[PDB]
Structure 1
Amino acid sequence: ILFKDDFNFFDEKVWTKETHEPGWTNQELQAYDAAHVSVGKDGDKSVLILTAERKGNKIYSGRINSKGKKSFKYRKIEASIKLPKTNGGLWPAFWMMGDNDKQWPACGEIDIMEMGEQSGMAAGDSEKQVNTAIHYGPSAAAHEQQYYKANVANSLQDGNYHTYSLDWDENNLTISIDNVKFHTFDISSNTYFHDNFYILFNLAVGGAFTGITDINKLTGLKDGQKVNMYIDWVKIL
């Protein structure tokens, strides 16, 4: 183990909490703020907690990153995550961007796990449909992306913690879920995935990815509701 965070506390030398207005990216409905990121207990576990809540028409959630604090290259990274039921517009993600000052997508982006996609609800598989992706290219105008979408065998939104893994070498990005290989992206000739990347976790609410960009269509977080995304640990081997 090169690095482990067991989330016994919020380590400010490793993580930064993000603050953003609603609609900052992807037509998302939440504001991100520091108050919606915490570390606390989930029974016997100590966990990172991203909390999405809705107060009338205002939605708040949490997002963190390790940019300029912890980054790596060509290692396996694994995280143990418990997800809320996403149906109706929640959008959790565990992902990475290049730890450099290039403007997205030129920094490079690896989406290890995303759930909540519009097509997942449309196929009645919202608890099982996972998206993994890579985005890259020199500018927003020249944004390229490769995606893989499929259903895992069992619900990932079942009240238990599940393991999401990235194995990374100079040729391949391999995503696994509960030790079952999900997809491999070939990056052997892709210049964007050969430098250090930092880690992100977030719980977005609505957004283009979900198909839900109008708060009136947001059934997955009703007025007065709070929902939590939990990360027991993250480690890099």
Structure 2
Amino acid sequence: ILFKDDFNFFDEKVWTKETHEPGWTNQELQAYDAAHVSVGKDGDKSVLILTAERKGNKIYSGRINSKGKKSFKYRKIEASIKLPKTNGGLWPAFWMMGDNDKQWPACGEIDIMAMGEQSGMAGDSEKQVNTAIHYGPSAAAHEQQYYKANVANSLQDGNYHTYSLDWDENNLTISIDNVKFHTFDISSNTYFHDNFYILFNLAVGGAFTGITDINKLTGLKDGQKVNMYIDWVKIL
């Protein structure tokens, strides 16, 4: 291990909690605030908790990043994550962006795992996983590669699962519970050859989910709190 966070506490030398108004990105419904990021117990475990909450028609959730604190290149990153049932608008994600001062998408983005896509709500919202890379010199010149597939068993089953990215000069390889899920070829792609930092978030609604109006949100009701739990993250 080059780095491990077991989430016995929220380490401000490594992570920053984000604060944003509703609809900051992707027509998302949640506001992000510090109060919806916590470290606490889940049975015998000490875990990072990102909490989506609805209070009337207002939605709050959590997002963290390691920008300017922890970044790496050409290493394996793994996280153990327990995901909420996403059907009806939840959008959890484990991802990376270039540790530089370039605006997205020119910083590069690696979406290791996201769930909650519009199309999973034919198919099985509990099994449908999306991985992606985004790049290009501006929002006008955005390029994306995308893979979507259903794993064998629910990933939204009350258990922790391991999400991995293997990274070298040629390939980004995503694995789930140590089984290869997809490879992106970065051998000629100039955006994936510098330090990247880590993000975790629990978005609510947004274009990815197909829910961009609070009146269409079915997965979070008035007063409800739904959690995304990260037991640990390691860089080998």
TM-score interval, smaller chain? over 0.9
Q: Could you report, residue by residue, the CA deviation over 1:179-235 in whole angstroms, capped at 9, with x for unpaired residues?
A: 110000000000000000000000000000000001111000111110000000000
Instruction: Report the counterpart of residue 21 of structure 2 in structure 1.
Output: 21
Secondary structure at 1:209's aligned position in 2? helix
Per-residue deviation, 1:124: 3.5
Following TM superposition, the consecutive aligned residue runs of length 4 or more in structure 1 with deviations greater than 4 angstroms are: none
Q: Where do 1:21-170 residues align within 5 Å?
A: 21-121=21-121, 123-170=122-169
Measured in 1, the distance between the counterparts of 2:123 and 2:182 equals 22
Q: Could you report, residue by residue, the CA deviation over 1:106-157 in whole angstroms, capped at 9, with x for unpaired residues?
A: 0000000000000001x23100000000000001110000000000111000
Measured in 2, the distance between the counterparts of 1:180 and 1:119 equals 23
Measured in 1, the distance between the counterparts of 2:234 and 2:130 equals 21
Measured in 1, the distance between the counterparts of 2:188 and 2:233 equals 28
Q: Could you report, residue by residue, the CA deviation over 1:8-49 in whole angstroms, capped at 9, with x for unpaired residues?
A: 000000000000000000000000000000000000000000
Measured in 2, the distance between the counterparts of 1:163 and 1:221 equals 26
Secondary structure at 1:222's aligned position in 2? coil
Aligned residues: percent identity? 100
Runs (5+) with no aligned partner, structure 1: none
Measured in 2, the distance between the counterparts of 1:16 and 1:104 equals 18
Question: Cα RMSD (Å) of the superposition?
Answer: 0.4
Measured in 2, the distance between the counterparts of 1:79 and 1:196 equals 18
Secondary structure at 1:216's aligned position in 2? helix
* Aligned length, in residue pairs: 236
Per-residue deviation, 1:173: 0.1
Measured in 2, the distance between the counterparts of 1:110 and 1:48 equals 21
Measured in 1, the distance between the counterparts of 2:74 and 2:127 equals 28
Secondary structure at 2:191's aligned position in 1? helix
TM-score by length of 2: 1.00
Measured in 1, the distance between the counterparts of 2:129 and 2:137 equals 27
Measured in 1, the distance between the counterparts of 2:199 and 2:164 equals 14
Measured in 1, the distance between the counterparts of 2:99 and 2:151 equals 30
TM-score by length of 1: 0.99
